[PDB]
Design an enzyme around this catalytic site. Structure first.
Site, PDB file in Angstrom:
ATOM      1  N   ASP A 188     -39.338 -73.366 -66.912  1.00  0.00           N
ATOM      2  CA  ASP A 188     -40.588 -72.986 -67.550  1.00  0.00           C
ATOM      3  C   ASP A 188     -40.377 -72.389 -68.945  1.00  0.00           C
ATOM      4  OD1 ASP A 188     -43.556 -72.327 -67.318  1.00  0.00           O
ATOM      5  OD2 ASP A 188     -42.695 -70.331 -67.670  1.00  0.00           O
ATOM      6  N   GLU A 228     -39.434 -77.537 -69.581  1.00  0.00           N
ATOM      7  CA  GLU A 228     -40.775 -77.577 -70.146  1.00  0.00           C
ATOM      8  C   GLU A 228     -40.727 -77.071 -71.582  1.00  0.00           C
ATOM      9  OE1 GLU A 228     -45.189 -75.593 -70.040  1.00  0.00           O
ATOM     10  OE2 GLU A 228     -43.308 -74.475 -69.803  1.00  0.00           O
TER      11      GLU A 228
HETATM   12  K     K Z   1     -46.258 -71.630 -67.221  1.00  0.00           K
END
Ligand code: K
Ligand code: CA
Ligand code: CA
Ligand code: K
Ligand code: NA
Ligand code: NA
Ligand code: NA
Ligand code: NA
Ligand code: NA
Ligand code: NA
Ligand code: NA
Ligand code: NA
Lengths: 505, 506
Positions: A188, A228
């Site tokens: 993330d 990400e």
């Molecule tokens: K997130």
């Protein structure tokens, strides 16, 4: 033995409720393993399942325990076992850019300031930082004001990745979950590991994942890794030493859903994961509605056809395709800007025609009721963007030969039989608005994939070698078949508007 | 006394100023607010469509030669053009010639009398079946014939047939008519779609169409302003047009990279394009920035204001006509919705007053929001989802506040008026880095170097290529500016701090 697995992104809270509280849970996931297997997916990426403050799970308070809303560690271990027994890998959402401000580490840093071992885990100060961007403060029990940096806000203090203690702690987290059977990690906020502002420090953040990759692959050589990196710039995406989600291709398709010259080459990111939507975007079906200003039910079939065409592309291009749960039935949803925000693109998965039945999640109904939302009858059926009996459910699409669900099942089942897609390289042959054509080739198979996304204008090409058509798709009539037809080198082939083909050497 | 790059203000008449008390902004209301516009530093107003039309926004027209009754009369319009002209403000008309309403008398006649109608050739119509074909619609006339017609934007927006010389003659006639009313130029709606059988079809053919259009208009009025709405973020598509267009590429780039990006200016450049940060089809820029930073709290307003200000500074100094969407200058908030209302919330009543109420305040949205059952932001009461009483977002609260967005914008625009290099000059890129935007503007009368560092963290520096005098300094982080002069020499190094801009003069 599959380089480019199909990934299914699951929000556990909205998938399947196995014990009746309306909250999707881990045992619920195990109970739907047959659906996942039949869909044709290779791996599930779970949104964060660690103990966390907020419903989405991105503000963690314990990296080594399971969120109680979802179940227990035993549940998690069992579910991983069940997915493995069904040929499905498990990808964990690793949230290490920040923790919750309720994380025990941070609470201790606040209380004991410079005497805390966790003071250097974060970016903290006792000196006044009032007015400075992304700085926040708390007052501890001794009445001292403690300042800290938190890019994503006061409740998400940033970890200090220059600390070797933090790096060792990340190694321990990785080790721990690999020991539980996890097959890989989705990292993330990989854009933000370093940086004093939103778009600062992408080079340093990319460099960080050199050591991370080396460590993970040292412990588990076949581990799946994807970062990400929330950027539509191919240079930024390509900087990373790990695969990342290809936001560039995703944005391009959304901006140009009838094609654009140069679309594939201009948005290419080697080894990237391909996708059309995720838990941070408007649903793809809804985006298409907004694009065409086609919001009425008589336009659903029109929209479905365009959606299917782009799924076909990300299922055949080199890279791992990612389906966001419910995408396969055309699930609708727009992000809101208050009094709810991302809940409406993270709504209960619609298993049933009626909107209700065994295992149906409904945690959103109280959220929408407390927020005063009645649009879409949300406060009673739990979904702003789904209604009873509207054709958007697994039950309604399950046995429909023309449903988006069965198209996707068909292509993904087809995909499993073709090593050139599972493992092969890629060579672009045509990259025009109305003719996308590329070879996929492994040591075992060579394919030519062609697609015309243009609704009006045909195009054509000449075969470079003898090949056999093994798949035909007509998106306008929404039919497909595998009738074999031989073609010779030098033969001209016309690709009609909204058709696709796969040829095999 | 020419200005090649006038500052344009985009007005939705319905939402500006209500002069007769029905809650609907009107044309006489615009006249009454001419002092505000002049003092803001505006050179021209582009009005959203004021022709007779079915919908509140005006883009589905039923009479090209009459004024929408909600807004007033033809006499009102003529007087308003006169008033603006007397105040040095030009008038740009929204010309909506891609399509008409299906309630336009031309279309009604074509449907009813088919091939015997003078207007049959005006549309893309057929008696042959077109069922299942995209963007084809039908109506059945009083004789029971099914009449098919093409309408890219939908059944109630039948496309005009621009391959018909009759339609070209009609367009000439509309243009001649409004020119005779004193209109100074045209913003051409949906210029991307003049031709094309689908949304992204026919951009080259549409661009070609505007060669004859430009030639005709300029033959009638050589100094006419022209700007096409080409709804595309692709610089190649935008540059294809023979008339200026709105620079969507730069707008999207700034929204995507509000802390700068290498190549920002050059990668998004469109010669002669109009520069803008928001319009009536987009989330408000202030709201966009809030979403970008996930900063929706009132304690973040200042932070957002500062970022908004530096990009207005940029489009006010770059080569091109900048466009301010009404209320942008006070940082008006607003997100597009997707039902039960859609674009109304980015087209809300202009906030003149601290309280939300006062003379001339429009409130037409109150009934819209009440009928749609929207209570969020107390909208069914004050008519605004995205404005509250006494929240700092109004002309009244900002007009005499030294640190308001309105005073900064007003300052820069009135500064701009005094500099021929910006009003008329060429442009030469000097630096194009994430944390150093720098470009020359030069006319025969003046040469400037404009410099901006949008990066909130990292300073940069450059070396002067000639002696110049600093004539403007802006500190966006402290939100202060000054024009105390400072001389600099060729070869001397200058450091541009984060969130600062400068203008140097030869
Ligand atoms: K997130
Ligand atoms: Ca449903
Ligand atoms: Ca207000
Ligand atoms: K329009
Ligand atoms: Na449950
Ligand atoms: Na960063
Ligand atoms: Na960070
Ligand atoms: Na519903
Ligand atoms: Na009025
Ligand atoms: Na077009
Ligand atoms: Na047209
Ligand atoms: Na309000």
């Amino acid at each position: 033995e599959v380089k480019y697995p199909v990934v299914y992104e699951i929000f556990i809270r909205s998938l399947y409720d196995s014990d009746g509280d309306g909250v999707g849970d881990i045992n619920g996931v195990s109970q739907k393993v047959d659906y996942l297997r039949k869909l044709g997916i290779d791996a599930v990426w779970f949104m964060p399942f660690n103990e966390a403050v907020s419903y989405h799970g991105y503000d963690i308070t314990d990296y080594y325990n399971v969120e109680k809303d979802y179940g227990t560690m035993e549940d998690l271990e069992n579910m991983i076992q069940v997915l493995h027994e069904n040929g499905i890998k498990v990808i964990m959402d690793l949230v290490i850019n920040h923790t919750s401000d309720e994380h025990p580490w941070f609470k201790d840093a606040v209380e004991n300031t410079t005497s805390s071992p966790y003071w250097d885990y974060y970016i903290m100060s006792l000196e006044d930082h009032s007015g400075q961007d992304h700085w926040h403060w708390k007052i501890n029990s001794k009445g001292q004001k403690v300042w800290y940096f938190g890019l994503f806000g006061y409740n998400m203090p940033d970890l200090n990745h220059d600390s070797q203690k933090v790096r060792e702690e990340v190694k321990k987290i990785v080790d721990f979950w690999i020991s539980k059977g996890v097959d890989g990690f989705r990292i993330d906020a990989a854009k933000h590991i370093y940086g004093w502002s939103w778009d600062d420090g992408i080079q340093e953040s990319a460099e960080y994942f050199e050591w991370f990759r080396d460590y993970v692959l040292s412990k588990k050589p076949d581990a799946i890794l994807v970062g990400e990196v929330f950027s539509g710039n191919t240079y930024d995406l390509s900087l990373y030493p790990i695969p990342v989600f290809n936001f560039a291709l995703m944005y391009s398709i959304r901006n140009y859903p009838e094609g654009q010259d140069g679309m594939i080459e201009n948005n290419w990111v080697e080894e990237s994961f391909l996708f059309l939507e995720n838990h941070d975007l408007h649903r793809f079906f809804s985006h298409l509605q907004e694009h065409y200003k086609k919001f009425s039910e008589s336009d659903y079939e029109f929209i479905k056809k365009r959606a299917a065409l782009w799924y076909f592309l990300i299922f055949t291009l080199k890279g791992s395709p990612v389906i966001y749960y419910g995408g396969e039935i055309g699930t609708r949803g727009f992000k809101w800007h208050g009094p709810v925000y991302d809940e409406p693109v993270r709504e209960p998965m619609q298993w049933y025609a009626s909107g209700t039945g065994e295992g149906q999640t409904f945690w959103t109904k109280e959220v929408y009721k407390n927020a005063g939302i009645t649009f879409g009858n949300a406060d009673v059926d739990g979904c702003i963007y789904d209604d009873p009996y509207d054709g958007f459910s697994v039950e309604e699409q399950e046995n429909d030969p023309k449903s988006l669900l069965n198209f996707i099942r068909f292509i993904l089942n087809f995909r499993k039989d073709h090593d050139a897609i599972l493992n092969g390289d890629q060579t672009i042959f045509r990259d025009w608005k109305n003719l996308i054509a590329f070879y996929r080739e492994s040591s075992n198979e060579k394919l030519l994939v062609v697609l015309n996304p243009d609704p009006v204008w045909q195009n054509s090409f000449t075969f470079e070698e003898n090949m056999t058509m093994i798949l035909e798709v007509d998106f306008e009539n929404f039919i497909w078949n595998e009738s074999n037809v031989s073609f010779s080198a030098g033969e001209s082939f016309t690709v009609d508007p909204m058709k696709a083909y796969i040829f095999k050497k």
